[PDB]
Write a protein that binds this ligand. Sequence first.
Ligand SMILES: C[C@H]1OC(c2cccc(O)c2O)=N[C@@H]1C(=O)NCCCN(CCCNC(=O)c1cccc(O)c1O)C(=O)[C@H]1N=C(c2cccc(O)c2O)O[C@@H]1C
Ligand SMILES: [Fe+3]
Length: 296
Amino acid sequence: NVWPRTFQNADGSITTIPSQPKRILSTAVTVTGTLLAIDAPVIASAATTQSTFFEQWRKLAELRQVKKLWPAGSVDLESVYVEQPDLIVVSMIGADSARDQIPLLQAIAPTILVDYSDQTWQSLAQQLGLATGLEEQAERTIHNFEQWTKQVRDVLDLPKGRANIVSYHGPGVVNAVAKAQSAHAQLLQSVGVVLEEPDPAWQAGSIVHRDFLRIHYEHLTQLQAETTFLITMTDQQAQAFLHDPILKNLPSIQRKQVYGLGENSFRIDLFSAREIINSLLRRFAGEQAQSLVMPL
Ligand SMILES: C[C@H]1OC(c2cccc(O)c2O)=N[C@@H]1C(=O)NCCCN(CCCNC(=O)c1cccc(O)c1O)C(=O)[C@H]1N=C(c2cccc(O)c2O)O[C@@H]1C
Ligand SMILES: [Fe+3]
């Protein structure tokens, strides 16, 4: 395990990490879940704009004494200095991105930049494993999860056809649909779901996103999949989608195959991925469900 080592950042820049990181500070709440997943020594993390940690890993973060820092958008440099980190992690795109603050952060400690929007949680874990010297941990974690998804894939009786994954906000608002490279789409694909891709031409406005295509509301009526999964929703919450009169003729609504992906499914990390797969076992597997549900 060689140190120093060079890390390739998502913007084409490089960062030399002089020594194995032991005090990692995350500036992106999305990335923190994956740092926890590989048991990296993350000692502090910024939060959502609402000053929260994601619920799938909050209790674990508290147990490991991960200090909650600023809500996304407002980097507190004093807090970074006081934590005395030896690696600072930044995301490329998303509400939790501190990309423009990199020069200020790099003055404090080696700062790296990753894009979680177009890779699986496993790929992000591998990338972070290489930055932290935790390749053994990451590889083991990924391998174990993949052994599990194999087993699950073999017992699910999924609806015929394909599924889409939607972030729903109702009429008169820009909504969003998961793209093939998203952590969400790839997670479902891994247990045998066949994914519908939103038409790239439906992009709303000028901002490019690799995770979910942002679209005018009306385009939701054009989705063809027989099944719809809603992020950040329970099944009960998904009822609002099902009863939206504008969407009454959607194949997934006609077949009453609209499901919540789960309360904690907004971002995908090992912890929310487990919850999501557990939900699929409960709904689509028989008395084979329980033999495979993972303890949280
Ligand atoms: C539990 C909460 O933590 C965050 C969160 C945490 C960390 C990073 C994020 O991005 C986060 O959203 N999300 C929840 C929250 O604040 N809910 C209140 C509504 C926020 N909303 C409006 C609703 C439409 N968005 C989607 O349907 C959607 C779908 C799929 C993926 C997404 O990221 C989506 O937001 C947003 O658009 C928010 N994201 C941008 C943003 C800005 C610049 C570049 C981007 O890529 C952006 O997303 O700006 C807002 C703050
Ligand atoms: Fe967002």
